[PDB]
Design a protein around this nucleic acid. Sequence first.
RNA 1: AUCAGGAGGUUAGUGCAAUGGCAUAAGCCAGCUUGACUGCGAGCGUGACGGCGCGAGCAGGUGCGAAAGCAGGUCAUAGUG
RNA 2: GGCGGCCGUAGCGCGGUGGUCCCACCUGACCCCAUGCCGAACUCAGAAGUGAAACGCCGUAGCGCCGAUGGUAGUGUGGGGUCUCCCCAUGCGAGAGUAGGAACUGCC
Lengths: 131, 177, 84, 94, 113
Amino acid sequence: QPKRTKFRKMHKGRNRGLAQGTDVSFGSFGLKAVGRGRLTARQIEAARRAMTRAVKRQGKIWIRVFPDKPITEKPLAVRMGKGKGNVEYWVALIQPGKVLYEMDGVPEELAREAFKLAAAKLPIKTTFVTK
Amino acid sequence: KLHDYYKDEVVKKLMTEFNYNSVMQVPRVEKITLNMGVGEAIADKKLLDNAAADLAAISGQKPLITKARKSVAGFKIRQGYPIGCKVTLRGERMWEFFERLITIAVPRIRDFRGLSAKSFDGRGNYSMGVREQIIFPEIDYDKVDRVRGLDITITTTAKSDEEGRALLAAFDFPFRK
Amino acid sequence: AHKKAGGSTRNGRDSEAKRLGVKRFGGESVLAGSIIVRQRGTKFHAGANVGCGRDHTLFAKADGKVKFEVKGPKNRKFISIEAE
Amino acid sequence: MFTINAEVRKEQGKGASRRLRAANKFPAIIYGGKEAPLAIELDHDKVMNMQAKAEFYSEVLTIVVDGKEIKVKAQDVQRHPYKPKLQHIDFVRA
Amino acid sequence: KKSARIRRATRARRKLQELGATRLVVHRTPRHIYAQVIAPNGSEVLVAASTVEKAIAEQLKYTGNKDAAAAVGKAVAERALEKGIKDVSFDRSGFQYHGRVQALADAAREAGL
RNA sequence: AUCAGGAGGUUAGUGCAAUGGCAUAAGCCAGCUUGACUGCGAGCGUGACGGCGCGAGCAGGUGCGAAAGCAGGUCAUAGUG
RNA sequence: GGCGGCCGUAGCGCGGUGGUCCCACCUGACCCCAUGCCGAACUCAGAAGUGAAACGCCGUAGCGCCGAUGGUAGUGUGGGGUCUCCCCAUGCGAGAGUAGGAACUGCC
């Protein structure tokens, strides 16, 4: 699927947004996912809102990858109208070795349980990384 | 005459006791622009005649009638309407009209003040404020209809309020505080 | 009137350009090659364009410009057979 | 002062490197100003556990290549993708 | 190609380089006048003479007039013919007509160039 | 609105749908002036095929320029049978 | 400052310092000559005053550009397996990184 964006027509809005956590200090942690895959904005919200709703203990939870690749669909016959932007909103491109969610935290992992809850929402076997 | 000493003698002195720097920058040549009073509105097709007719007596040559750039904007302006009419030139002329202007005929008006308010604030271009009735040694006393009163400007490249005006009060008076 | 809808060029036809002028045999003073019109300067072999280089050779004939900013638009300095 | 054993990179290549990584060994390059750069073959197991210790990059590592030490410090470490391991590390004589 | 700084000042001339000959630059100073016969590839000056050198002969009046510009042309050209050059083009970078440069050129031909 | 100063390769502008080119400029302003000349060839369009077009000479001559030089209409590619 | 050589690593910014030898600024416009409106341009003349803009030297490598020592991803090419897919052989190696050059050289 040739990477896409817009410069076309305006579609729906972002189901995501709340970056959460404080960004006064930049860290280098994360949660890598072995395997490339396209994740829609919605599923990203469910996973993000899953951990954020569990890491009430603190914060410093952040995400680097965001959906920037639109995908249109077409319901009915066919013969006039390339594609409209429906349920299929922006989608993020994840690399075989890309870090998605990283939380600035020293060995006190209380979010591993949160990342686990989210790891069951995105279609891809993710693994927990300390580095 | 009394004008050459101001660019070799009374220029180093005003740069020693309260400056401490080089020789240049304070103060050159470059033409001096002499604008005219807005002739628009006053009357109709006229005044332009008595104009350039009196502005050609105190100096040489005659003003030119130039228009603006044909480019309509957000204002009531047509295409091809004489406006501005400005002409400035030098070479060695703008040096004497700084003598016979502030020496004679003044103080010699009728009700001259003496104290002037702080014209500029943080710039170089000063200011002015003369009335309509003036008496000059280079103008007839009885034969001129409609008295004219044009301002007087001076371009300078200063950097601070002080260090300046100290050269103006070196020949052009009065000026009390 | 004015233009709109941002984009690159604007689609055309099939490129009409060749590359005549062996410049290693007989060569009458004329346009050596064909791609873009209007250009002067080179009076002999002056094949010189950014890259690995360029070249031509042998042919005694005064003047001989190129096509334009293409196959060595730069103007070198003289060149002929070996002893015309 | 961590003491590690190593050799010299003769067959410099990705193919030869993979045969070493399979035997728990990875390449490395050492430089030191006037000293001519040198590519060696360090032990994977050892270095891996030693690089985990922060002080690893601050110590004057005593790498004994073949039969003699060199004494250098760690700079950067290139990790492997699909399998979390050491791919290549840079060093500087100290 | 783009226009070099020299081409932007149009002081040079590529049309005179395509021939493969020499030039006859005419430098002018509010005090003296100079002329040279420089050849391509750098600033190779074969022969040259200054109006100040004209005094060596027997010059009295000023050296910043027209009659002086013509005297220099005859000198620079005379020395040129002694060198081995016959033809030469005029190269006056920025100047008016009928000026001192014209008198310099007219003087060069008077010699044999 | 205008004018003065500073920053500013230029995103301006250049007739036209776009790309490419250009600033002590093919851009702008002003002045001047007007080569859109005649005749005849060589070359260019994988693969032969006309009209037409274009680049580049020669012979004789119009315009402008000091001259080289520039033109076969308007920077090039649609406005034709 | 004069006078040469090499002669696009001399694009473009920036620093120190020196010669009243030289040179722009500057200064003055009587005249040749010239500005459609303005000796500003143009052109001519003298040199009070500096080096604030040249030039001679010489100190930074930013950025452009031209070379050199080291190498992962990517990629050329031909066989292997494998659900997709991936691997191997072989010629190189993104781009990052370590360095070279801000003139060089003779004479008065």
